[PDB]
Design an enzyme around this catalytic site. Structure first.
Site, PDB file in Angstrom:
ATOM      1  N   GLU A  33       6.973  -3.773   0.101  1.00 24.87           N
ATOM      2  CA  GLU A  33       6.916  -4.699  -1.023  1.00 24.87           C
ATOM      3  C   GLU A  33       6.493  -3.972  -2.286  1.00 24.87           C
ATOM      4  O   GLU A  33       7.221  -3.978  -3.283  1.00 24.87           O
ATOM      5  CB  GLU A  33       5.911  -5.802  -0.714  1.00 24.87           C
ATOM      6  CG  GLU A  33       5.764  -6.889  -1.760  1.00 24.87           C
ATOM      7  CD  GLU A  33       4.661  -7.859  -1.374  1.00 24.87           C
ATOM      8  OE1 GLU A  33       4.923  -8.873  -0.675  1.00 24.87           O
ATOM      9  OE2 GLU A  33       3.503  -7.572  -1.733  1.00 24.87           O
ATOM     10  N   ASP A  71      12.861  -8.524   2.758  1.00 29.86           N
ATOM     11  CA  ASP A  71      12.720  -8.917   1.363  1.00 29.86           C
ATOM     12  C   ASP A  71      12.342  -7.734   0.443  1.00 29.86           C
ATOM     13  O   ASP A  71      12.815  -7.676  -0.700  1.00 29.86           O
ATOM     14  CB  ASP A  71      11.800 -10.132   1.194  1.00 29.86           C
ATOM     15  CG  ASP A  71      10.348  -9.813   1.434  1.00 29.86           C
ATOM     16  OD1 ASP A  71      10.022  -9.001   2.339  1.00 29.86           O
ATOM     17  OD2 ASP A  71       9.445 -10.355   0.756  1.00 29.86           O
TER      18      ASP A  71
END
Ligand SMILES: OC[C@H]1O[C@@H](O[C@H]2[C@H](O)[C@@H](O)[C@H](O[C@H]3[C@H](O)[C@@H](O)[C@H](O[C@H]4[C@H](O)[C@@H](O)[C@H](O[C@H]5[C@H](O)[C@@H](O)[C@H](O[C@H]6[C@H](O)[C@@H](O)[C@H](O)O[C@@H]6CO)O[C@@H]5CO)O[C@@H]4CO)O[C@@H]3CO)O[C@@H]2CO)[C@H](O)[C@@H](O)[C@@H]1O
Length: 642
Positions: free
Chosen positions: A60, A228
């Site tokens: 991330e 993600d």
């Protein structure tokens, strides 16, 4: 803590972004590791949420790091930072050839060995069953290998940058992992462990028999991606490429574009059921072709093999959360020449995927407008029959809180902003019409929930409560009159505010390009959020913006029991004893030497929530990028105190 920004009215968003960029990148501020330039989760070390220590890195954080440099390049013309970012990424967080030994022995016809998931960490370790469970096939591995080699080009999610846990040699950055034990295992209920398992620590079989019960135990490595992060990164590279070519400087990012393309091809692994079981089976029916493909970005892909003898395994994931979808990145690898997958089938799969994801958002859209959690292909984690009256989506069951229930994974409003920002970029770049109603309803909802105050403060939704179900997906949105979202609390979260401002400015830009007129209200609200986050949470020591948050949950430092199976025993690299009865703090004993230990511990004694100031890496970037978005699509706009 926070103090007002001194910023002069009429400062360009460009200039604001350049100020924040400068502060994020200043080595005195401490956002990045001194030896290797890896971005930490946050400047502060004492912090617990997803990661349980501030000086881990996550994939991330890296994706945000790439995004930041992309925007920098756009506003500035200096593209070297994008290359640097991607270099640090492959030098450290992507496992290279030497760190996935004998992945070449992986078998597509027997990808992995089935194991149940359970509703409580106490049920673990979970039993591997070569016995009675036949597993589906992996239809993607061969053409990936054929293009790339034997290895997996993905980011492992978590890395102990300065080896604070000790699992590593000296002070080297070390792959580690935490979550293992089902839906009720929060950050507070884990046992951190190294990814490369050499038995050097833990019990007699290292940490393995804590999680997965085998007939025999051997030295192994394993990794997990959080897709993600990869989506965000490739998304950022699309923009880096676009902006760089506008300037006649595309060559400065061509190699990164190539790597990003490859990365995108591998994200295909995230499209399949955990054990390649038929989508919609309600049973452990192995699948043969692409019958195991849900075509969404599932919660993870994980893969590993032996360290000693050569063998290997790979899993997808059966659980899917709307907050993890990235139809924009999907669309980039499906349609864009420079990001064309080297594999022979990638372009086609991605074409299916992005469209499939766009339907997911539509299906999940509550009657009010916010997007509900997601769906699963393996009910209770064991492929059980779906309860009667369970609405479905291409055979998968609706779940309000995919993967985790403490807290429920769709309570956090952040996913709304994160995820619908991608959909906005998708509408920006395609003018796709099928997505217009989704977007407008969601904007209407978000606009109804943002609170602006005459004193220049703001509040945005923090926590969401869900009831009901979507109607079963027929290919067409029904309005889901019985799916409801309710906002139960509000706060002042700086990353979420940045992210939401991005989404609204991007959306606004999209209405200008594609519709009869510019959505002036969305544009102005984007500017309000950025103005108010910056004015109200400015850090006067020059570190950017800074949060002030009561962390009631920090009582769990000392109150939360970490399950250890009875009879199991072992030690952390510093002696801390892993045995039944332990609390969070017992296996993380070094925390007692933290600058913020006293503060959180004294707040424990007095029975009150401690108050923290945090500079999270991604909070700073989400805010900076939002500024940069305003600078890009609305270059005449200009900061003012709110
Ligand atoms: O045949 C030759 C030799 O074989 C050996 O047996 C092998 C066997 O062949 C093979 O099948 C087996 O592989 C299994 C592994 O044992 C086991 O570790 C693995 O467990 C998975 C687990 O199923 C999965 O749910 C779990 O996912 C975690 C994930 O790790 C974690 O990172 C993630 O965290 C996320 C956070 O939730 C999120 O908030 C954050 O943002 O991102 C994170 C995601 O990026 O959470 C998920 C769950 O929520 O991962 C573990 C692995 O880490 O399952 C494999 C298949 O079932 O290995 C065996 C060896 O151990 C024989 O032992 C030998 O005799 C033979 O010679």
């Amino acid at each position: 803590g926070p103090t007002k920004a001194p910023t002069k009215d009429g400062t360009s968003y460009k200039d604001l972004f350049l100020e924040l960029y400068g502060k994020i990148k200043d080595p005195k501020n401490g956002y990045f590791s001194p030896d290797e330039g890896i971005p930490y989760h946050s400047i502060e070390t004492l912090i617990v949420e997803a990661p349980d220590y501030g000086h881990v890195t996550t994939s991330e954080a890296f994706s945000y790091y790439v995004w930041l440099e992309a925007m920098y390049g756009n506003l500035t013309g200096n593209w070297s930072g994008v290359e640097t970012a991607w270099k640090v990424m492959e030098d450290w967080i992507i496992p290279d050839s030497t760190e996935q030994p004998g992945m070449s022995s992986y078998n597509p016809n027997s990808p992995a060995t089935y194991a149940d998931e359970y509703e409580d960490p106490s049920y673990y370790p979970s039993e591997l069953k070569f016995d009675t469970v036949r597993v589906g096939s992996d239809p993607v591995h061969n053409d990936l290998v054929s293009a790339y080699g034997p290895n997996m080009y993905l980011m492992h999610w978590l890395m102990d940058v300065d080896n604070w846990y000790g699992f590593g040699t000296g002070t080297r950055a070390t792959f580690i992992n935490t979550f293992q034990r089902g839906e009720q295992e929060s950050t507070w209920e884990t046992i951190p462990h190294p990814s490369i398992e050499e038995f050097k620590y833990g019990g007699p079989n290292g940490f393995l028999d804590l999680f997965t019960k085998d007939r025999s135990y051997a030295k192994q490595w394993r990794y997990t991606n959080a897709p993600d992060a990869e989506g965000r990164a490739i998304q950022a590279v699309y923009w880096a490429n676009k902006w760089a070519k506008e300037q006649g400087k595309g060559s400065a990012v061509a190699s990164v574009v190539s790597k990003a393309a490859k990365m995108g091809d591998f994200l295909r692994n995230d499209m399949f059921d955990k054990y390649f079981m038929k989508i919609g089976a309600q049973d452990k029916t192995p699948a043969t072709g692409y019958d195991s493909a849900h075509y969404l970005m599932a919660w993870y892909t994980a893969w590993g093999g032996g360290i000693g003898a050569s063998w290997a395994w790979k899993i997808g994931c059966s659980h899917a959360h709307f907050g993890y979808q990235n139809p924009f990145q999907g669309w980039v690898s499906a349609t864009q020449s420079d990001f064309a997958p080297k594999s022979s089938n990638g372009k086609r799969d991605w074409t299916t995927s992005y469209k499939r994801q766009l339907e997911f958002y539509q299906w999940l859209q509550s009657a009010e407008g916010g997007i509900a959690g997601g769906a699963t292909n393996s009910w209770n984690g064991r492929y059980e029959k779906y309860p009667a009256g369970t609405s479905t989506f291409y055979g998968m069951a609706y779940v309000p809180h995919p993967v985790y229930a403490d807290p429920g994974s769709n309570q956090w409003f952040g996913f709304q902003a994160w995820s619908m920002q991608r959909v906005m970029e998708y509408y920006l770049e395609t003018g796709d019409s099928s997505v217009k109603n989704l977007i407008k309803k969601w904007v209407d909802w978000v606009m109804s929930e943002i609170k602006l105050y005459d004193d220049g403060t703001f509040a945005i939704p923090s926590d969401l409560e869900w009831s009901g179900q979507p109607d079963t997906w027929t290919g067409t949105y029904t309005g889901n009159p019985n799916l409801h979202v309710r906002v139960t609390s509000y706060g002042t979260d700086l990353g979420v505010a940045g992210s939401l401002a991005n989404a609204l400015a991007t959306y606004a830009a999209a209405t200008e390009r594609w519709e009869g007129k510019l959505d002036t209200k969305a544009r102005d609200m984007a500017a309000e959020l950025v103005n108010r986050a910056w004015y109200n949470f400015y850090c006067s020591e020059g570190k950017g913006v800074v949060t002030e948050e009561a962390r009631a949950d920090y009582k769990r430092f000392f109150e939360q029991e970490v399950y250890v199976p009875a009879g199991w025993s072992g030690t952390m690299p510093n002696g801390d004893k892993i045995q039944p009865g332990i609390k969070f703090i017992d296996i993380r004993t070094k925390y007692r030497q933290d600058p913020y230990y006293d503060i959180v511990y004294q707040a424990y004694l007095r029975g009150e929530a401690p108050v923290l100031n945090y500079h999270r890496f991604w909070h700073e970037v989400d805010l900076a990028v939002a500024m940069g978005v305003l600078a890009t699509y609305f270059p005449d706009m200009t900061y003012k105190v709110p």
